[PDB]
Amino acid sequence: QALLDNQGVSCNLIRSFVGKGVRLWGCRTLLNEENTAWRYIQIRLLVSSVEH
Amino acid sequence: TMVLPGVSYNETLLTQASNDDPVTMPLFIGYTPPPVTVMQPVSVGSLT
Numbered sequence A: 001q002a003l004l005d006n007q008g009v010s011c012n013l014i015r016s017f018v019g020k021g022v023r024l025w026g027c028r029t030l031l032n033e034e035n036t037a038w039r040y041i042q043i044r045l046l047v048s049s050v051e052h
Numbered sequence B: 001t002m003v004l005p006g007v008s009y010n011e012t013l014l015t016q017a018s019n020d021d022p023v024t025m026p027l028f029i030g031y032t033p034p035p036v037t038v039m040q041p042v043s044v045g046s047l048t
Helices: A042-051
Strands: A013-016 A022-025
Touching: none
Parallel strands: none
Antiparallel strands: A013 A022
16 A cells, blocks of 8 residues: 555556456556656656657 | 546436425314323324
8 A cells, every 4th residue: 555655656567367367457657647648657668669 | 646537327307296285284183082192283184
């Protein structure tokens, strides 16, 4: 129940599900922040390949 | 720091149903014909 304090930076949780497998449960970058489009890790990486 | 989809269940309601109008109800306020209270109104199904 620690790390549930969202005062330090975010994580990526990994969860084992019941009727399906161990499902990945986190994609939100350590910009622990609500407005910059630099959480949601795929957004960080989608641009970078276009930059590439 | 993480979070689940939060499926967020709720529901709504119904029921205006209130209808009574017990103004048309009479009250017989006599003495006891000779173990009721001395004070309470008592409903009557029938004379039977």
